[PDB]
RNA sequence: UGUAUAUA
Protein backbone atom coordinates (compact mmCIF):
# COMPACT_ATOMS: atom_id res chain seq x y z
CA UNK A 1 0.00 0.00 0.00
CA UNK A 2 1.15 3.51 -0.90
CA UNK A 3 -0.53 6.88 -0.39
CA UNK A 4 -0.53 7.63 -4.12
CA UNK A 5 -1.77 4.12 -4.94
CA UNK A 6 -4.53 4.39 -2.34
CA UNK A 7 -5.71 7.82 -3.51
CA UNK A 8 -5.89 6.80 -7.17
CA UNK A 9 -7.95 3.70 -6.35
CA UNK A 10 -10.30 5.55 -3.96
CA UNK A 11 -10.13 9.36 -4.19
CA UNK A 12 -13.15 9.73 -1.87
CA UNK A 13 -11.26 8.64 1.23
CA UNK A 14 -12.80 8.44 4.69
CA UNK A 15 -10.33 11.11 5.82
CA UNK A 16 -10.20 13.42 2.81
CA UNK A 17 -6.65 13.92 1.59
CA UNK A 18 -5.12 17.38 1.97
CA UNK A 19 -1.82 18.75 0.73
CA UNK A 20 -0.26 18.45 4.20
CA UNK A 21 -1.11 14.73 4.00
CA UNK A 22 1.13 14.16 0.95
CA UNK A 23 4.10 15.68 2.78
CA UNK A 24 7.22 13.73 1.85
CA UNK A 25 5.43 12.28 -1.20
CA UNK A 26 5.23 15.44 -3.32
CA UNK A 27 7.45 14.17 -6.14
CA UNK A 28 5.49 10.92 -6.47
CA UNK A 29 2.14 12.72 -6.44
CA UNK A 30 3.26 15.56 -8.71
CA UNK A 31 4.64 13.28 -11.43
CA UNK A 32 1.46 11.17 -11.46
CA UNK A 33 -1.34 12.13 -13.84
CA UNK A 34 -4.04 11.66 -11.20
CA UNK A 35 -1.77 12.79 -8.36
CA UNK A 36 -0.83 16.06 -10.06
CA UNK A 37 -4.52 16.69 -10.74
CA UNK A 38 -5.17 16.40 -7.00
CA UNK A 39 -2.53 19.02 -6.16
CA UNK A 40 -3.99 21.33 -8.81
CA UNK A 41 -7.47 21.03 -7.30
CA UNK A 42 -6.32 21.75 -3.74
CA UNK A 43 -3.98 24.57 -4.80
CA UNK A 44 -6.99 26.19 -6.51
CA UNK A 45 -9.77 25.31 -4.03
CA UNK A 46 -8.31 25.05 -0.51
CA UNK A 47 -9.27 28.05 1.61
CA UNK A 48 -6.52 27.16 4.11
CA UNK A 49 -3.67 29.31 2.81
CA UNK A 50 -1.24 27.40 5.04
CA UNK A 51 -2.00 24.06 3.34
CA UNK A 52 0.10 24.90 0.27
CA UNK A 53 3.18 25.77 2.36
CA UNK A 54 3.40 22.19 3.67
CA UNK A 55 4.46 20.90 0.23
CA UNK A 56 6.05 24.08 -1.12
CA UNK A 57 9.65 23.39 -0.06
CA UNK A 58 9.37 19.95 -1.69
CA UNK A 59 8.21 21.65 -4.90
CA UNK A 60 11.18 24.04 -4.80
CA UNK A 61 13.85 21.38 -4.26
CA UNK A 62 12.37 19.20 -7.03
CA UNK A 63 11.62 22.09 -9.41
CA UNK A 64 14.32 20.93 -11.85
CA UNK A 65 12.35 17.68 -12.24
CA UNK A 66 8.79 19.08 -12.20
CA UNK A 67 8.88 22.07 -14.57
CA UNK A 68 9.56 19.87 -17.63
CA UNK A 69 7.35 16.93 -16.67
CA UNK A 70 4.24 16.02 -18.65
CA UNK A 71 2.17 16.33 -15.45
CA UNK A 72 4.45 18.03 -12.92
CA UNK A 73 4.51 21.36 -14.75
CA UNK A 74 0.87 22.04 -13.86
CA UNK A 75 1.77 21.85 -10.17
CA UNK A 76 4.50 24.47 -10.62
CA UNK A 77 2.16 26.74 -12.60
CA UNK A 78 -0.54 26.67 -9.92
CA UNK A 79 1.94 28.04 -7.37
CA UNK A 80 2.49 31.05 -9.63
CA UNK A 81 -1.30 31.36 -9.99
CA UNK A 82 -2.31 31.06 -6.32
CA UNK A 83 0.96 31.77 -4.53
CA UNK A 84 2.31 35.16 -3.51
CA UNK A 85 5.62 36.92 -4.08
CA UNK A 86 7.35 34.86 -1.40
CA UNK A 87 6.36 31.80 -3.43
CA UNK A 88 7.40 33.40 -6.72
CA UNK A 89 10.90 34.44 -5.63
CA UNK A 90 11.74 30.93 -4.42
CA UNK A 91 10.34 29.28 -7.56
CA UNK A 92 12.26 31.65 -9.85
CA UNK A 93 15.51 31.18 -7.91
CA UNK A 94 15.00 27.41 -8.18
CA UNK A 95 14.58 27.31 -11.99
CA UNK A 96 16.72 30.27 -13.06
CA UNK A 97 19.84 28.19 -13.77
CA UNK A 98 18.27 26.23 -16.65
CA UNK A 99 15.95 28.91 -18.07
CA UNK A 100 18.19 28.95 -21.21
CA UNK A 101 17.03 25.33 -21.62
CA UNK A 102 13.47 25.57 -20.25
CA UNK A 103 12.54 28.15 -22.90
CA UNK A 104 12.92 25.47 -25.59
CA UNK A 105 11.14 22.70 -23.66
CA UNK A 106 7.51 21.91 -24.47
CA UNK A 107 6.28 21.68 -20.88
CA UNK A 108 8.89 23.91 -19.22
CA UNK A 109 8.11 26.85 -21.52
CA UNK A 110 4.54 26.77 -20.17
CA UNK A 111 5.90 27.45 -16.67
CA UNK A 112 8.02 30.37 -17.91
CA UNK A 113 5.03 32.02 -19.60
CA UNK A 114 2.84 31.59 -16.52
CA UNK A 115 5.62 33.06 -14.38
CA UNK A 116 5.99 36.13 -16.61
CA UNK A 117 2.19 36.36 -16.50
CA UNK A 118 1.91 36.48 -12.70
CA UNK A 119 5.15 37.63 -11.04
CA UNK A 120 6.46 41.14 -10.37
CA UNK A 121 8.84 43.15 -12.54
CA UNK A 122 12.14 42.41 -10.69
CA UNK A 123 11.46 38.68 -10.94
CA UNK A 124 10.39 39.15 -14.58
CA UNK A 125 13.76 40.72 -15.42
CA UNK A 126 15.46 37.80 -13.66
CA UNK A 127 13.95 35.36 -16.17
CA UNK A 128 14.47 37.91 -18.94
CA UNK A 129 18.20 38.20 -18.20
CA UNK A 130 18.66 34.46 -18.82
CA UNK A 131 16.84 34.68 -22.17
CA UNK A 132 19.48 37.16 -23.42
CA UNK A 133 21.95 34.32 -24.00
CA UNK A 134 19.61 32.41 -26.34
CA UNK A 135 17.29 35.14 -27.61
CA UNK A 136 18.13 34.78 -31.32
CA UNK A 137 17.53 31.02 -31.31
CA UNK A 138 14.60 31.34 -28.89
CA UNK A 139 12.75 33.85 -31.09
CA UNK A 140 11.95 31.33 -33.86
CA UNK A 141 11.71 28.11 -31.84
CA UNK A 142 8.49 26.10 -31.77
CA UNK A 143 8.32 26.56 -27.97
CA UNK A 144 10.58 29.55 -27.29
CA UNK A 145 8.53 31.95 -29.40
CA UNK A 146 5.71 31.71 -26.85
CA UNK A 147 8.18 32.67 -24.11
CA UNK A 148 9.41 35.69 -26.09
CA UNK A 149 5.80 36.65 -26.89
CA UNK A 150 4.81 36.71 -23.22
CA UNK A 151 7.86 38.79 -22.29
CA UNK A 152 7.02 41.44 -24.89
CA UNK A 153 3.42 41.15 -23.67
CA UNK A 154 4.00 41.57 -19.93
CA UNK A 155 7.18 43.57 -19.23
CA UNK A 156 7.87 47.24 -19.84
CA UNK A 157 9.15 48.28 -23.30
CA UNK A 158 12.54 49.48 -22.02
CA UNK A 159 13.18 45.96 -20.68
CA UNK A 160 12.52 44.22 -24.02
CA UNK A 161 14.97 46.63 -25.68
CA UNK A 162 17.48 43.80 -26.13
CA UNK A 163 14.85 41.88 -28.10
CA UNK A 164 14.29 44.85 -30.42
CA UNK A 165 18.07 45.08 -30.71
CA UNK A 166 18.12 41.43 -31.81
CA UNK A 167 15.44 42.08 -34.45
CA UNK A 168 17.47 44.99 -35.85
CA UNK A 169 20.95 43.54 -35.25
CA UNK A 170 21.25 42.31 -38.84
CA UNK A 171 19.78 43.80 -42.00
CA UNK A 172 17.65 40.72 -42.78
CA UNK A 173 16.46 39.61 -39.33
CA UNK A 174 13.12 41.44 -39.56
CA UNK A 175 12.35 39.77 -42.89
CA UNK A 176 13.42 36.29 -41.74
CA UNK A 177 11.33 36.63 -38.58
CA UNK A 178 8.31 37.94 -40.52
CA UNK A 179 8.30 34.92 -42.85
CA UNK A 180 8.99 32.42 -40.03
CA UNK A 181 5.94 30.54 -38.68
CA UNK A 182 6.94 31.22 -35.06
CA UNK A 183 9.06 34.35 -35.44
CA UNK A 184 6.22 36.25 -37.10
CA UNK A 185 4.33 36.22 -33.79
CA UNK A 186 7.26 37.85 -31.97
CA UNK A 187 7.17 40.65 -34.55
CA UNK A 188 3.42 40.95 -33.99
CA UNK A 189 3.62 41.25 -30.20
CA UNK A 190 6.38 43.84 -30.58
CA UNK A 191 4.25 45.87 -33.00
CA UNK A 192 1.44 46.27 -30.43
CA UNK A 193 3.36 46.50 -27.13
CA UNK A 194 6.72 48.16 -27.84
CA UNK A 195 7.39 51.90 -27.75
CA UNK A 196 7.33 54.14 -30.85
CA UNK A 197 11.13 54.49 -30.81
CA UNK A 198 11.29 50.68 -31.00
CA UNK A 199 8.51 50.05 -33.54
CA UNK A 200 9.56 52.77 -35.99
CA UNK A 201 12.85 50.99 -36.90
CA UNK A 202 11.05 47.63 -37.14
CA UNK A 203 8.21 49.04 -39.26
CA UNK A 204 10.76 50.70 -41.53
CA UNK A 205 12.47 47.34 -42.07
CA UNK A 206 9.11 45.80 -43.02
CA UNK A 207 8.72 48.44 -45.74
CA UNK A 208 12.14 47.59 -47.22
CA UNK A 209 10.76 44.17 -48.28
CA UNK A 210 7.04 44.92 -48.25
CA UNK A 211 6.13 42.91 -51.36
CA UNK A 212 7.77 39.67 -50.23
CA UNK A 213 6.31 39.97 -46.72
CA UNK A 214 2.79 40.94 -47.82
CA UNK A 215 2.25 37.77 -49.88
CA UNK A 216 3.94 35.46 -47.36
CA UNK A 217 1.71 32.97 -45.55
CA UNK A 218 2.96 34.41 -42.25
CA UNK A 219 4.28 37.84 -43.26
CA UNK A 220 0.83 39.00 -44.37
CA UNK A 221 -0.27 38.85 -40.72
CA UNK A 222 2.72 41.08 -39.95
CA UNK A 223 1.66 43.63 -42.57
CA UNK A 224 -1.88 43.47 -41.19
CA UNK A 225 -0.54 44.26 -37.71
CA UNK A 226 1.33 47.31 -39.01
CA UNK A 227 -1.97 48.48 -40.51
CA UNK A 228 -3.71 48.14 -37.14
CA UNK A 229 -1.05 49.32 -34.65
CA UNK A 230 0.98 51.63 -36.91
CA UNK A 231 0.99 55.38 -37.37
CA UNK A 232 -1.04 57.44 -39.83
CA UNK A 233 1.97 57.67 -42.16
CA UNK A 234 2.42 53.89 -41.97
CA UNK A 235 -1.09 53.11 -43.22
CA UNK A 236 -0.65 55.76 -45.93
CA UNK A 237 2.54 54.20 -47.30
CA UNK A 238 0.95 50.74 -47.08
CA UNK A 239 -2.32 51.78 -48.73
CA UNK A 240 -0.42 53.45 -51.58
CA UNK A 241 1.76 50.40 -52.23
CA UNK A 242 -1.17 47.98 -52.30
CA UNK A 243 -3.22 50.34 -54.48
CA UNK A 244 -0.29 50.72 -56.90
CA UNK A 245 -0.35 46.92 -57.35
CA UNK A 246 -3.94 46.05 -56.48
CA UNK A 247 -4.60 43.24 -58.97
CA UNK A 248 -1.57 41.09 -58.17
CA UNK A 249 -2.13 41.69 -54.45
CA UNK A 250 -5.83 40.84 -54.70
CA UNK A 251 -5.39 37.75 -56.91
CA UNK A 252 -2.99 36.00 -54.50
CA UNK A 253 -3.90 33.78 -51.57
CA UNK A 254 -2.26 35.62 -48.67
CA UNK A 255 -1.80 39.23 -49.81
CA UNK A 256 -5.53 39.45 -50.56
CA UNK A 257 -6.27 39.64 -46.82
CA UNK A 258 -3.97 42.68 -46.62
CA UNK A 259 -6.26 44.75 -48.84
CA UNK A 260 -9.21 43.68 -46.69
CA UNK A 261 -7.27 44.97 -43.67
CA UNK A 262 -6.66 48.24 -45.53
CA UNK A 263 -10.39 48.49 -46.27
CA UNK A 264 -11.34 47.58 -42.69
CA UNK A 265 -8.86 49.99 -41.08
CA UNK A 266 -8.50 52.71 -43.71
CA UNK A 267 -9.85 56.25 -43.75
CA UNK A 268 -11.94 57.74 -46.55
CA UNK A 269 -8.97 58.81 -48.68
CA UNK A 270 -7.39 55.39 -48.14
CA UNK A 271 -10.43 53.63 -49.62
CA UNK A 272 -10.62 56.26 -52.37
CA UNK A 273 -7.15 55.14 -53.47
CA UNK A 274 -8.19 51.48 -53.55
CA UNK A 275 -11.43 52.28 -55.39
CA UNK A 276 -9.63 54.55 -57.85
CA UNK A 277 -7.11 51.87 -58.78
CA UNK A 278 -9.78 49.16 -59.04
CA UNK A 279 -11.97 51.30 -61.31
CA UNK A 280 -9.48 53.23 -63.46
CA UNK A 281 -6.45 50.93 -63.76
CA UNK A 282 -6.61 48.10 -66.27
CA UNK A 283 -5.85 44.37 -66.23
CA UNK A 284 -5.94 43.22 -69.84
CA UNK A 285 -7.99 45.99 -71.50
CA UNK A 286 -10.71 45.75 -68.81
CA UNK A 287 -10.90 47.35 -65.35
CA UNK A 288 -9.07 45.77 -62.43
CA UNK A 289 -12.30 45.24 -60.48
CA UNK A 290 -13.91 43.34 -63.38
CA UNK A 291 -11.05 40.83 -63.52
CA UNK A 292 -11.05 40.73 -59.71
CA UNK A 293 -14.66 39.50 -59.68
CA UNK A 294 -13.78 36.38 -61.70
CA UNK A 295 -10.78 35.53 -59.48
CA UNK A 296 -10.84 32.87 -56.76
CA UNK A 297 -9.39 35.24 -54.13
CA UNK A 298 -9.97 38.78 -55.41
CA UNK A 299 -13.76 38.33 -55.38
CA UNK A 300 -13.53 38.46 -51.58
CA UNK A 301 -11.84 41.86 -51.87
CA UNK A 302 -14.61 43.14 -54.16
CA UNK A 303 -17.08 41.96 -51.51
CA UNK A 304 -15.02 43.72 -48.86
CA UNK A 305 -14.87 46.86 -51.01
CA UNK A 306 -18.62 47.08 -51.64
CA UNK A 307 -19.26 46.68 -47.88
CA UNK A 308 -16.59 48.99 -46.41
CA UNK A 309 -16.52 51.74 -49.05
CA UNK A 310 -18.27 55.11 -49.23
CA UNK A 311 -21.60 55.11 -51.08
CA UNK A 312 -20.14 57.58 -53.59
CA UNK A 313 -17.08 55.41 -54.20
CA UNK A 314 -19.52 52.49 -54.47
CA UNK A 315 -21.28 54.35 -57.29
CA UNK A 316 -17.97 54.53 -59.18
CA UNK A 317 -17.66 50.76 -58.77
CA UNK A 318 -21.23 50.13 -59.95
CA UNK A 319 -20.80 52.28 -63.06
CA UNK A 320 -17.49 50.56 -63.83
CA UNK A 321 -18.94 47.07 -63.39
CA UNK A 322 -22.42 47.37 -64.94
CA UNK A 323 -21.49 47.24 -68.68
CA UNK A 324 -19.31 44.17 -67.99
CA UNK A 325 -22.03 42.17 -66.19
CA UNK A 326 -22.88 39.95 -69.22
CA UNK A 327 -19.17 39.13 -69.49
CA UNK A 328 -18.88 38.27 -65.79
CA UNK A 329 -21.89 35.92 -65.80
CA UNK A 330 -19.88 33.45 -67.91
CA UNK A 331 -17.35 33.02 -65.07
CA UNK A 332 -18.15 30.89 -62.00
CA UNK A 333 -16.78 33.40 -59.49
CA UNK A 334 -18.32 36.24 -61.50
CA UNK A 335 -21.85 34.85 -61.38
CA UNK A 336 -21.38 33.87 -57.73
CA UNK A 337 -20.58 37.34 -56.42
CA UNK A 338 -22.83 39.09 -58.93
CA UNK A 339 -25.56 37.22 -57.04
CA UNK A 340 -24.28 38.35 -53.64
CA UNK A 341 -23.90 41.86 -55.11
CA UNK A 342 -27.36 41.90 -56.73
CA UNK A 343 -28.23 44.07 -53.70
CA UNK A 344 -26.84 46.97 -55.77
C1' U B 1 -15.72 29.77 -52.92
C1' G B 2 -9.58 31.80 -49.75
C1' U B 3 -4.33 32.08 -44.72
C1' A B 4 -0.79 30.89 -39.02
C1' U B 5 -1.39 30.57 -33.86
C1' A B 6 1.88 24.70 -29.35
C1' U B 7 0.88 20.42 -22.89
C1' A B 8 -2.68 15.20 -19.86
Residue numbers in the entry: 174 to 517
Question: What do the study authors state?
Answer:
PUF proteins, named for PUM (Pumilio) and FBF (fem-3 binding factor), are an exemplary system for understanding the divergence of RNA recognition within eukaryotic RNA-binding protein families. Each repeat contributes a trio of amino acid residues, termed a tripartite recognition motif (TRM), that directly contact the opposing RNA base. FBF recognizes a 9-nt motif, 5´-UGURNNAUA-3´, whereas PUF-8 binds an 8-nt sequence, 5´-UGUANAUA-3´.
The 5´-UGUA and AUA-3´ base specific interactions bracket a central region in which the 5th base turns away from the concave RNA-binding surface and stacks directly with the 4th base. As a result, the 5th base is not recognized by PUF-8, and PBE RNAs with any nucleotide at position 5 are bound by PUF-8 with similar affinity. The mode of RNA recognition and overall curvature of PUF-8 are reminiscent of the one repeat to one base modularity of PUM1. Superposition of the structures highlights this relationship as the RMSD is 1.2 Å over 293 Cα atoms, and the inner RNA-binding helices align with similar curvature. Aligning repeats R5-R8 illustrates that the curvature of the PUF-8 scaffold contrasts starkly with the flatter FBF-2 scaffold.
